[PDB]
Amino acid sequence: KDTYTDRLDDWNGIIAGNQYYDSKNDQMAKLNQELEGKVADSLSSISSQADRIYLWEKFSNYKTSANLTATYRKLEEMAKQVTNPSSRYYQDETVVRTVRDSMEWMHKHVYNSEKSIVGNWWDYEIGTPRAINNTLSLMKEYFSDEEIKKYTDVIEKFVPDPEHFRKTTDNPFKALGGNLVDMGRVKVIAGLLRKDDQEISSTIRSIEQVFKLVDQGEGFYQDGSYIDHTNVAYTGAYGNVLIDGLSQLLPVIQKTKNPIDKDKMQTMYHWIDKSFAPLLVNGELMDMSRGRSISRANSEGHVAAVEVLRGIHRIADMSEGETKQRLQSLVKTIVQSDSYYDVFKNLKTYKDISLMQSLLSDAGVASVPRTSYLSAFNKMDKTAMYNAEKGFGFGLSLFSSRTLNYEHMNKENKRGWYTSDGMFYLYNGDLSHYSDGYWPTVNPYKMPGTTETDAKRADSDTGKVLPSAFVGTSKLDDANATATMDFTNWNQTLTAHKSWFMLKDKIAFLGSNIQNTSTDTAATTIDQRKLESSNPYKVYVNDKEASLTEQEKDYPETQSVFLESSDSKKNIGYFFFKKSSISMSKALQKGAWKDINEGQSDKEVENEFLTISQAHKQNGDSYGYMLIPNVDRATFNQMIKELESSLIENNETLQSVYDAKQGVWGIVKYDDSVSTISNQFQVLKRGVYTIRKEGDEYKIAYYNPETQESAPDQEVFKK
């Protein structure tokens, strides 16, 4: 036909990839079989109505916008198979007619220009328009240009401006990040289908906004942080959509009359290296960056990581030289380190499957274990740490006056209340820990690392920002960093100076100035670990075996707790600097995804959890322990003797831990007094410090979380 048809061909090759199908290809045949099964269920349940109320009973209530998108996506699946020579529905007359009559019908009494948004705007402006564009693009050889325009006009009505969304509403918003990229998958493709040049260029010009790094608001930051929805850490969900979608569009956009400059897109590599890579551990995308996505059963950590990975791979594929090789190496190593999730379970197009296969089999592409790293995403109040030598990841989830604690929207993530109240994540040998139903079964009132009262919480509640701006991480190098959070709980009835000292192969948790003005009880959850019935843990308290029950047992005068597995890479030890009074329990916890996300299944799910907590019955209480993972029993026992005097101070104004072996100090100061440390030096400014001594020279890393600035050494360090 023309260049528009040419671009749409490229698009079809990216969103479906039928030209790349090979029946002898196992992974490919598996996706084909899934699509076959999907079309057969749709065609068999579609109402052979005499013009009935709906096309599919399951998606009948057209008041629930979700049903418009689900319906058109079923037609897209049909379009994918009708153009697949290997599908039993290839060129099938009844499927071609079902798709054509279904479009005329939906366009008749459900989705048209004379309609208004009912329910979610996203379905009307992104979900449905994408499914329609894809359906028409794939089956453009069965539709007339006039029919195509006819079926896309409704998209032009709901989405006429490539710069704003919710345009037909009373309060539209500027499109950026993930939503802006979907604006390209909506208007660039519809523009191609309609052969509308102004639409194409105006939309590509708008998408280019996505390449600019920001220092405020939504978007990617220089330090690797990604914020969306005003002030929510969102690299792992909206960022996913951003890279996933942009990578599909680029090859098509780059072949139109409005290609995008090569230096404008150079920031893509910054996202990959600074924003995405640090959040990927053993093939898992850290949940602290996925917002409300965590409450979706079909998008657990390893699954969400493939959206990013397939996006990175595409980018690598259209790159060249060492950039291509290096990105290739990045994707290869991450995928191969994932022994838990089969990457192919989330590569939904033949070209994506093909790319992955050749990548994994090309001996020319290096696949070397990733090195140690520590990212202080201070612009989104999150910190990611990875130790390659011992093999564990650590995630610190916080929030402040600059960021929302959790997102509960569209009935999703109803109980994420405390997922940012100083919650921590440990990524060890059990790659499935935060998967297999962790979210719907974890007790939402006892999120690991958090200090909270036992007051009941409502599902209808929504996120809040923190009163204090004193939240931040001072990074010294790839293995050492210190963080603090001037914590106040949701109803301002409890406070705590929570601090963390990341010291290469361990993390110290310090909390002081714990006050409670309410009548509820306060306690800090040391941990709530999801167990594997296959790899049971042998629990020790003070080095003596302990038998945990469903009922809470008290362990006063506890100096240590050790969780021993047959696999040392799953071991977790906790060393209490000062004998502490803790309680522990191991109980089967049940729940359903629908409990935390209305749109999910109410099918019962269950998992065994080991919970460790320390109550705080008096004002001015505190806690202090070192988390030491991946070492065996004897090594842990030897290490706690070494750390005997690692606690320097832990009060209302000063918290510090010293790593004698490393010669590294972690310090948090809440005021400007002169603090003398280990009779060696003095720190003089309120803020966060990570200091290392090398001979008589001192390496200083200082960060004032409030002003988001460091300071000349002579201002904060002395002697």
Ligand X SMILES: C[As](C)(=O)[O-]
Ligand Y SMILES: CC(=O)N[C@@H]1[C@@H](O[C@@H]2OC(C(=O)O)=C[C@H](O)[C@H]2O)[C@H](O)[C@@H](CO)O[C@H]1O
Chain residues in the site for ligand X (CB under 6 A):
411, 414, 458-460, 598
3-state secondary structure of 431: coil
Q: Which residues contact 552 (CB under 8 A, 6 or more apart)?
A: 583, 584, 585
CB 460, min distance to Na ion, A: 4
Would residue 498 be called left, alpha or beta, if left means φ above 0 and alpha means ψ between -120 and 50 degrees? beta
Structure tokens at 261: 């400059």
Give, rounded to a whole angstrom, the gap between the first and last alpha carbons of the chain: 77
Judged by beta carbon distances under 5 to 8 A according to partner kind, the member of Na ion, ligand X, ligand Y, none in contact with residue 9 is: none
Rounded Cα distance, 73 and 76, in Å:
5
CB of 390 to ligand X, least distance (A): 40
The neighbour count for residue 520, using CB atoms within 10 Å, is 13
Closest CB to ligand Y: residue number: 237
397: partner contacted, choices ligand Y, ligand X, Na ion, none (Cβ within 5-8 A by kind)? none
Q: How far is the CB of 413 from ligand X (least distance, A)?
A: 9
From the list 62, 67, 84, 229, the catalytic residue is 229
Distance CA 304, CA 302 (A): 6
User: Which C-beta is closer to ligand Y: that of 185 or that of 529?
Assistant: 185
**Contact map string, positions 101 to 120, toward ligand Y, x by CB under 6 A:** -------------------x
With contact defined as beta carbons under 8 Å apart, do 268 and 245 qualify?
A: no
Residues near 1 by beta carbon (within 8 Å), at least 6 away in sequence: none
Note whether 122 binds ligand Y by CB under 6 A: yes
Is residue 238 part of the annotated active site? The answer reads yes
**Smallest gap, in angstroms, from Cβ of residue 477 to Na ion?**
45
Smallest distance from ligand X to CB 595, Å? 10
Both tokens of residue 103? 């479009």
For the bound state, the minimum distance from the C-beta of residue 580 to Na ion, rounded and expressed in Å, comes to 33
Q: Does 128 bind ligand Y (CB under 6 A)?
A: no
| Alpha-carbon gap, residue 257 to 241, rounded angstroms | 25
Taking alpha carbons only, the member of 306, 309, 367 closest to residue 336 is 367
What the block records as the tokens of 518 is 């309410």
- From 12, 84, 179, 405, active-site residue: 179
**What one-character DSSP code corresponds to residue 701?**
E
Q: Which is nearer to ligand X, 187 or 414 (CB)?
A: 414
Neighbouring CB atoms inside 10 A of 680's CB total 12
Q: What is the DSSP letter of 274?
A: I
Residue for token digits 């306060």? 522
Which residues between 211 and 250 bind ligand Y (CB under 6 A)? 229, 237-238, 241
Of positions 59, 72, 111, 121, contacts ligand Y by CB under 6 A: 121
Q: Three-state DSSP class for 210?
A: helix
Output the smallest distance, CB 5 to ligand X, in A: 45
Give dist(CA 514, CA 468) in Å, integer: 16
Residue 344 is given by DSSP the state G
- Note whether 178 binds ligand Y by CB under 6 A: yes
* Residue 458 interacts with Na ion (CB under 5 A): yes or no: yes
Which of the listed partners (ligand Y, ligand X, Na ion, none) does 347 bind, with a CB threshold of 5 to 8 Å by partner kind? none
- Which of residues 224 and 591 has its CB atom nearest to ligand X in the complex? 591
Q: Where are the beta strands (DSSP E) in 256-345?
A: 280-281, 284-285
173 binds, among Na ion, ligand Y, ligand X, none (CB under 5 to 8 A by kind): ligand Y
Residue 451 in tokens = 């200090």
Catalytic residue status for 84: no
- Tokens read off for 143: 């539709």
10 Å CB burial of residue 411 (0-12, 13-18, 19+) is: middle
Task: Give 172 or 663: the residue with its C-beta nearer to ligand Y.
Answer: 172
Residue 327 backbone dihedrals phi, psi, to 5 degrees: -70, -40
d(CA 290, CA 431): 17
User: Which lies closer to ligand Y via its Cβ, residue 185 or residue 616?
Assistant: 185
Q: Reduced to 3 states, what is the DSSP secondary structure of residue 170?
A: coil
For residue 598 the two structure tokens come to 């209305």
**Smallest gap from residue 706 Cβ to ligand Y (A):** 26
- Find the binder of Na ion among 48, 94, 460, 534 (CB under 5 A): 460
CB of 408 vs ligand X, minimal distance in Å: 6
What number of chain residues touch ligand Y (CB under 6 A)?
Answer: 16
Closest distance to ligand X from the beta carbon of 301 (Å): 23
Catalytic option among 21, 72, 238, 350: 238
Q: How many CB atoms lie within 10 A of CB 472?
A: 25
Residues with Cβ within 8 Å of 287's Cβ and at least 6 positions away in sequence, in order, are 236, 294, 301, 395, 419, 425, 434
CA dist 495 and 719 (Å) reads 34
Q: Quote the least distance from Cβ 464 to ligand X, whole Å.
A: 15
Nearer to Na ion, 460 or 551 (CB): 460
User: Toward ligand Y, which CB reaches closer, 177 or 629?
Assistant: 177
Query: What minimum distance in Å lies between the beta carbon of 378 and ligand Y?
Result: 23
Integer angstrom CA distances of residue 285 from 399, 424, 441: 19, 14, 20
* Helix and strand totals (H; E) in the chain: 18, 31
Residue 54 contacts residue 47 (beta carbons within 8 Å):
yes
DSSP 552: -
151 binds, among ligand X, ligand Y, Na ion, none (CB under 5 to 8 A by kind): none
Nearest to 177 by CA among 238, 253, 122, 268: 238
Q: Using the rule CB under 6 A, which residue among 30, 45, 118, 173 binds ligand Y?
A: 173
**Span 274-333, contacts to ligand Y by CB under 6 A:** 293, 299, 307
Segment lying near Na ion (by CB under 5 A), choices 104-112, 457-465, 486-494, 505-513: 457-465
Binding flag, residue 635, ligand Y (CB under 6 A): no
Q: Do residues 615 and 521 touch, judged by C-beta distance below 8 A?
A: yes
What whole-number distance in Å separates Cα of residue 487 and Cα of residue 467? Answer: 8
Shortest separation between residue 600's beta carbon and Na ion, angstroms: 14
In the block, tokens 């359903």 appear at 592
Query: Is 497 marked active-site?
Result: no
Should residue 459 be labelled a site residue for Na ion when binding is judged by CB under 5 A? yes
Residue 411 binds which entry of ligand Y, ligand X, Na ion, none, CB below 5-8 Å type-dependent: ligand X
Q: Considering only CA atoms, which of 627, 407, 605, 608 is closest in space to residue 501?
A: 627
Does residue number 414 form part of the binding site for ligand Y (CB under 6 A)? no
Q: Are the C-beta atoms of residues 91 and 78 closer than 8 Å to each other?
A: no
CA distance 716 to 665: 14
Nearer to ligand Y, 177 or 391 (CB): 177
Return the active site residues: 179, 229, 238
Footprint of ligand Y (CB under 6 A): 120-122, 127, 171, 173, 178-179, 229, 237-238, 241, 293, 299, 307, 410
Catalog residues that contact Na ion under the rule CB under 5 A: 458-460
